[PDB]
Amino acid sequence: KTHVQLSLPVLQVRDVLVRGFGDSVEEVLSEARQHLKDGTCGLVEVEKGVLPQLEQPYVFIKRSDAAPHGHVMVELVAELEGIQYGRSGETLGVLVPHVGEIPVAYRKVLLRK
Numbered sequence: 001k002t003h004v005q006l007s008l009p010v011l012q013v014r015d016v017l018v019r020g021f022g023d024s025v026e027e028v029l030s031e032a033r034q035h036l037k038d039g040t041c042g043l044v045e046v047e048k049g050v051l052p053q054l055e056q057p058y059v060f061i062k063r064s065d066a067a068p069h070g071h072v073m074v075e076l077v078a079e080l081e082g083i084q085y086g087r088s089g090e091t092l093g094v095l096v097p098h099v100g101e102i103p104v105a106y107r108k109v110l111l112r113k
Contacts (some may be wrong), residue, residue, distance in 0.1 A: 003110045005071050006036060008043040008061075009103035011096065013050045016042070018097040020055030025078040025085045032059040032076055032095045035110055042098035043107050046091050056080050059095040062088030071110040109111055 022033035043061065044050060051058065057080040065073040066089075076095075077086035092107060106111035 002113065003073070004036075004112055004113050005017060005082055006039075006041075006109050007067065007106045008041060008093075008095075009042055009098055009101070010093070010105040011042040011098065011103055012099045013044050013053045015101040016044060016054070016096050017099050017101065019053070020096065021055070021059055022057075024079050025057050028057045028059050029076055029078050032071075033113070035095070035097055037113075040098050042096050042101065043093040043102070051094065053097070054094055060084075060088075061092045061095060061109060061111075062086075063090045063092060064088055068106075068110055071108045073110045073111045074113065075107045086109065104107055 021028035061074040
């Protein structure tokens with residue numbers, strides 16, 4: 001399938017134990033997709049002071065469309081030193097590994113895989 005319905009655990013930035021997916025734009029996008037597939041991916045909602053607490057490169061989920069079965073359609077965009085790789089809509093949050101942190105909510109998304 002080109003798209004997959006996922007329910008992403010929303011984590012508080014100060015709870016996150018593993019604060020990025022790796023060391024290159026290509027690696028973080030790769031790892032993010034693997035974790036999304038394995039159900040081991042969390043979402044941090046971006047506000048003032050969140051991103052500097054996480055590790056670059058960042059992986060964003062961004063709205064790709066204006067929501068089948070409650071699931072907002074999203075795609076992945078990476079960022080490193082203020083350059084983005086991809087072009088998409090509004091940020092829903094930054095993806096991080098989920099290693100058992102207790103979430104505050106779930107974000108239902110339809111991921112272009």
